[PDB]
Amino acid sequence: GSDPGPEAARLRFRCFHYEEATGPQEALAQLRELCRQWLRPEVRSKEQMLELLVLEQFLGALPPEIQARVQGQRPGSPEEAAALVDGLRREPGG
Amino acid sequence: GSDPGPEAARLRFRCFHYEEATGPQEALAQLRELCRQWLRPEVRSKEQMLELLVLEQFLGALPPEIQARVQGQRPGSPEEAAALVDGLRREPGG
């Protein structure tokens, strides 16, 4: 009755390495499946998908060191990530 | 006057570098806007967002060299990307 969580599902979604062995189209079927367990059109609407995806680019837009700090906590929401980094940009050392 | 288009919107969205000077939450506002110009709940539905976002991760799941090729052409559709990468992996490099 519990769900893994959208953030956990997204982690699995990105933990997926592109493997030529399964073929890119078949890999898509995996990614599509994994992203679907994260986005979930069934329960989430389009604007919520925006939020999740904003977070997505935002994290990778961060420098490796700041990004690692996020990745070491995993907020799952863009503004939370923003708040993590908001302090990290205040002279690296926190 | 028009929208950049979902394909170009993702470009602007991915070309966005995190700049501490604009702040993460202000950057979010830009990203939230850019991703919205890409996903567009206004015109598109959730499953379209699934697809666009599968593409997004699929490209990053690819190795830097293969990813660079996709990034240089920009299909915008996951299966289309799957098609070039399937070719790029034919005799690693093409």
Domain holding B40: CATH number? 1.10.4020.10
Select from B36, B16, B14 the least CA-distant residue to B24. Answer: B16
| Residue B44, phi then psi, degrees to nearest 5 | -105, 165
Q: Which residues contact A84 (CB under 8 A, 6 or more apart)?
A: A69, A70, A73, A75
**Burial (Cβ within 10 Å: 0-12, 13-18, ≥19) of residue A23:** middle
By residue range, what is the domain housing residue A59?
1-94
Q: Determined by which method?
A: NMR
A→B contacts (Cβ < 8 Å), by residue, are 13-14, 16-18, 20, 23-25, 27-28, 31-32, 35-36, 39, 41, 44-47, 49-51, 53-54, 56-58, 60-63, 66, 78-79, 81-83, 85-86, 89
Chain position carrying tokens 């030529």: A20
* Number of domains observed in the structure of chain A: 1
Number of Cβ within 10 Å of residue B31's Cβ equals: 25
Alpha-carbon distances of A31 from A14, A41, B11, rounded to whole Å: 8, 15, 21
